[PDB]
């Protein structure tokens, strides 16, 4: 029979499913929910059926396993959350029951049936009674992921914690809940032998910050949702009272209080007006209470007496180019080259469905010890750059005419806001943010551009102060990161000039049996949890060693989380609460995505190397590596640099990655992956399912066994192996259907003047010049048509082909 | 004088939010707290005197606001000025189980706070 | 402002299907409908010549819809508004 074991000795390190009261155990449950594979998941089916969470016919439904399509699978998991809470309450009635006896030992998952009683008292050592200690680090570390996937807390929150009892009328005016948090902790996590702080202001280093934010989220998934949000008081200026915010209450960092608050002031300068207009308090107080029955989120919506309904216009079809193309004998019957990319119109109910897509987002607890070791590894991956705070004279800001957010957009874009304030005002605002929280509201619009599918795309515009401070920090850090060549993350490198060739050669490096692989993350921005976003921000702040103390960095992390992670959105003419998931407004969200991707990859490798049984590993050096991996994960609380360097070198030798935000290319040694000692794709599927709450279907992850044909697809470009003057080089060529679509449909900015039309046409031809060297003639005819059309445009008012050839020569 | 422009703009915005702001019930809800420090999600919930409900279809008009006066936030609300999705005024005497497909959805139910 | 409709109509005439040209000829003669064709159809009959050329007794050839609803223009049973369903 097959069963999941968590064993550790001198011989064998790692949680492994091999062959050796309920039928199944807690370790089996965590494994089945943490190592999911829809091909062979009969154990999960049996677990769900055996205890009346739902019926086998529900599994007989198509896509019973998914989280996105048919999002009603959480209903059951919540019943298993009730079971989890029952079995987690017996972990404190046994520890304090054996501690008195005076017994030193470790508690493992695999000694506890699904009810909660225990067995197999074989490993512990006897000591004087009243002086015992159990080791329960690995237990809770591995049990964490299913304590918000199943929650248990909606079951807990009853008048005496009985499910047959009404809901508690909590006080509506009480906000802190610190004593209740500590009581929950001392009931559920009494023996966790590290200090937990109910507020995260009282923690010691960023690793403690992560640990306490994880526990704060788990404890804050049980409180009245009308409580988290800005805390306001009544302030007076020149006699007239205000209602402004003097704190905030996260789910992640508990209650935080401003330290520079001015009661009984007399006047407000520019910075005070900026912050007080950015406050949601004046807007949520001056407005009507709203109950929008369309969506399932909370909603306090005012500022107008009627909702606004916005629609998306259809495209503008161009007749001249299409007539030319049909005269060139294209789109004839039985062809592979046709039009498939269009402009789709939308209603506004599309905006409400987009907000429901924001609803596709859960509270997650992630594992903590593997998170801290993945964060050490990722810091090693980023150990080749330089960071720090800069003054207002060291930001370079580009493209100054983006949206300046709400309600700042009523009088201009960010250009006016940046040419209004002097540098000193921005530095003073920054220094104020170093001790204060400024909760903020974001405008949401609909996006108007090409797609292949009927769905609506949206975009978010964030306020000016949050972008200003993210600008200082990550202008320095990203200008350091992006001005490099040859690293793991490839951002800001032109694919031209042999750049793609050099990138691919660095991906090859010296890997033994190179096979290529890729992925994409289903619903990236909507499902990316809070823990990993905080971890990415914490890495980017860990690049601050010399400029900030603990307090400044914690206040900056709190500002980032309150402005980007869980702020309130102005959607139409309403104010809703945005539960989580990234905003699309800064570049440090593409870099948070990059960090997230690297995290995912490292976690996948860790699982693949530790969930493989070393007794079938024929090498012994990787066996010792796995043993030390388990040691550094579930043992030492301190950080060990030597083994981190060793594992980073191991990855760089056997797992070469080429990373852009959400879009990756992996070159890996094939025999290792066949043995599993580098990341396969089922490991990525399982990791995404259990830690990001989407299911990555197998039809969008590809595998290429010959390298002499390159990446199948990366960054929306295809590659072919061509010969160019006694050199075999890799060239990127697009999908030409997209090129034809962009040529026939334009969106009325270029329908006035021709210069920008020729600009668009030359850019399209440049992106699709290399199509000449593909074997098929039709693509070269596409390039010839584009050249002829640009020639005709130039005549009726870059026209020779060579200008585009030199675009792709590495000179 | 563009800096002063947006300065005066925000200042007049603040003053017009202030003229719509000061009551005594908000002062009593503040003075019933421990130290006056109060969340934000409960200021309009228990202070503002007008509720707006947007109703997508007929089954939720039937399950939410069937009648003249309805119940939300443990209080009673008195209806007025029912408006369709096109800002044309709809009489309450139309919204029925058979006539619903003939009228544009959703609908805007604007209520005033009944003591 | 006219050019968009001119291009639309020239493309429609180039398309050269039966139903499109049928509906164009009906609308230029005057015979336009009054609602969306269901995939219930209401049509205003301008003159008896189009009733003779299109309606044959109860059978009605339009793009075919078998029509029995006859009242009048003036909303009293006897132009003519006839509504039918696909048979």
């Amino acid at each position: 029979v097959y069963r999941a074991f968590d064993i550790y000795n001198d011989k064998v390190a790692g949680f492994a499913k091999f062959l050796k009261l309920t039928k199944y155990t807690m370790a089996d449950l965590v494994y089945a929910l943490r190592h999911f594979d829809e091909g062979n998941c009969d154990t999960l089916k049996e677990i769900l059926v055996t205890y009346n969470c739902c019926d086998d016919d529900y599994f007989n439904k198509k896509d019973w396993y998914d989280f996105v399509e048919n999002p009603d699978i959480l209903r059951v998991y919540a019943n298993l959350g009730e079971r989890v809470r029952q079995a987690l309450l017996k972990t404190v009635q046994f520890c304090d029951a054996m501690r008195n006896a005076g017994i030193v030992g470790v508690l493992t998952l695999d000694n506890q049936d699904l009810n909660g009683n225990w067995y197999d008292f074989g490993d512990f050592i006897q000591t004087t009674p009243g002086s015992g200690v159990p080791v329960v680090d690995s237990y809770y570390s591995l049990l964490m992921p299913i304590l918000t996937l199943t929650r248990a807390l909606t079951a807990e929150s009853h008048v005496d914690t009985d499910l047959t009892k009404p809901y508690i009328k909590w006080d509506l005016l009480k906000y802190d809940f610190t004593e209740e948090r500590l009581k929950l902790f001392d009931r559920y996590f009494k023996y966790w032998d590290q200090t937990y702080h109910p507020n995260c202001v009282n923690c010691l280093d960023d690793r403690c910050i992560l640990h306490c934010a994880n526990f704060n989220v788990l404890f804050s998934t049980v409180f009245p949702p009308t409580s988290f949000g800005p805390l306001v008081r009544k302030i007076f200026v020149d006699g007239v009272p205000f209602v402004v915010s003097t704190g905030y209450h996260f789910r992640e960092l508990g209650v935080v209080h401003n330290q520079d608050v001015n009661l009984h002031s007399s006047r407000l300068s520019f910075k005070e007006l900026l912050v007080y207009a950015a406050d949601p308090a004046m807007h949520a107080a001056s407005g009507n209470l709203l109950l929008d029955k369309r969506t399932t989120c909370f909603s306090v919506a005012a500022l107008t007496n009627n909702v606004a309904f916005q629609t998306v216009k259809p495209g503008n079809f161009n007749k001249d180019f299409y007539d030319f193309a049909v005269s060139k004998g294209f789109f004839k019957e039985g062809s592979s080259v046709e039009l498939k990319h269009f402009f789709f119109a939308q209603d506004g109910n599309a905006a409400i469905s987009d907000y429901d897509y924001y609803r596709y987002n859960l509270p997650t607890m992630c594992d903590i010890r593997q998170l801290l070791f993945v964060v050490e590894v990722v810091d090693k991956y980023f150990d080749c750059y330089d960071g720090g705070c800069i003054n207002a004279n060291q930001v370079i800001v580009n493209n100054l005419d983006k949206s300046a957010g709400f309600p700042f957009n009523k009088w201009g874009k960010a250009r006016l806001y940046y040419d209004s304030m002097s540098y000193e005002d921005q530095d003073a605002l920054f220094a104020y943010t170093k001790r204060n929280v400024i909760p903020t509201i974001t405008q949401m619009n609909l996006k108007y551009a090409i797609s292949a599918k009927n769905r609506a795309r949206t975009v978010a515009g964030v306020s000016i102060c949050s972008t200003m401070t993210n600008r200082q920090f990550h202008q320095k850090l990203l200008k350091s990161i992006a001005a490099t060549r040859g690293a793991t993350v490839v951002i800001g490198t032109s694919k031209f000039y042999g750049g793609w060739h050099n990138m691919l050669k660095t991906v090859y490096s010296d890997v033994e049996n190179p096979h290529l692989m890729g992925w994409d993350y289903p619903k990236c921005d909507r499902a990316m949890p809070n823990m990993l976003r905080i971890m990415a921000s914490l890495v980017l702040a860990r690049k601050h060693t010399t400029c900030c103390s603990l307090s400044h960095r914690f206040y900056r992390l709190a500002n980032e989380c309150a402005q980007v992670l869980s702020e309130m959105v102005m959607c139409g003419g309403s104010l809703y609460v945005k539960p989580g998931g990234t905003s699309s407004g800064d570049a440090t969200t593409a870099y948070a995505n990059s960090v997230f991707n690297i995290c995912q990859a490292v976690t996948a490798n860790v699982n693949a190397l530790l969930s493989t049984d070393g007794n079938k590993i024929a090498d012994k050096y990787v066996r010792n590596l796995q043993h030390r991996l388990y040691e550094c994960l579930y043992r030492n609380r301190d950080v060990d640099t030597d083994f981190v360097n060793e594992f980073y070198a191991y990855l760089r030798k056997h797992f070469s990655m080429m990373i852009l935000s959400d879009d990756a290319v992996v070159c890996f040694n094939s025999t290792y992956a066949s043995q599993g000692l580098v990341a396969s794709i089922k490991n990525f599927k399982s990791v995404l399912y259990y830690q990001n709450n989407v299911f990555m279907s197998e039809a969008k992850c590809w595998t290429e066994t010959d390298l002499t044909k390159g990446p199948h697809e990366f960054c929306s470009q295809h590659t072919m192996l061509v010969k160019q003057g006694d050199d075999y080089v890799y060239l990127p060529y697009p999908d030409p259907s997209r090129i034809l679509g962009a040529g026939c449909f334009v969106d009325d900015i270029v329908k006035t003047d021709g210069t920008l039309m020729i600009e668009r046409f030359v850019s399209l031809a440049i992106d699709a010049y290399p199509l000449t060297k593909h074997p098929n003639q039709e693509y070269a005819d596409v390039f010839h048509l584009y050249l002829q059309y640009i020639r005709k445009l130039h005549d009726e008012l870059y026209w020779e082909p060579e200008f585009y050839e030199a675009m792709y020569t590495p000179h | 004088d563009k800096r002063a422009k947006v300065t005066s703009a925000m200042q007049t915005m603040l003053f017009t939010m202030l003229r719509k702001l000061d009551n005594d019930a908000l002062n009593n809800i503040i003075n019933n707290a421990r130290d006056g420090c109060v969340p934000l999600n409960i200021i309009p919930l228990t202070t503002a005197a007008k509720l707006m409900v947007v109703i997508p279809d007929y089954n939720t008009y039937k399950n939410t606001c069937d009648g003249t006066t309805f119940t939300y936030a443990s209080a009673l609300w008195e209806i007025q000025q029912v408006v369709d999705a096109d800002s044309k005024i709809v009489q309450l005497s139309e919204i029925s189980m058979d006539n619903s497909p003939n009228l544009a959805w959703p609908l805007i139910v604007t209520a005033l706070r009944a003591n | 402002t006219s050019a968009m409709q001119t291009m639309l109509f020239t493309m429609l005439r180039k398309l050269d299907n039966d139903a499109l040209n049928n509906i164009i000829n009906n609308a230029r003669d005057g015979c336009v409908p009054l609602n969306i064709i269901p995939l219930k159809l209401m049509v205003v009959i301008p003159d008896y010549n189009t009733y003779k050329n299109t309606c044959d007794g109860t059978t009605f050839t339009y793009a075919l819809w078998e029509i029995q609803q006859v009242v009048d223009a003036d909303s009293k049973i006897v132009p003519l508004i006839v509504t039918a369903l696909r048979a």
Binding site: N454 | - | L8, N17, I23
Partner: protein
Amino acid sequence: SKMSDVKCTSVVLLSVLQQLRVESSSKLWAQCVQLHNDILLAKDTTEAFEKMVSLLSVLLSMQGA
């Protein structure tokens, strides 16, 4: 050349329809955009023309200029 021209006509017809402000009715504009998006996804030759004639009936049922 019989599958692309129908989509081009659908796009230009919906642009004309929008340019006469039919969006001032929810139901009619919703039906129009539904028919348009269902045309721009068609991979068969037949029902596209039914939807095209239905949208032209939508145009010529109101008093077009």
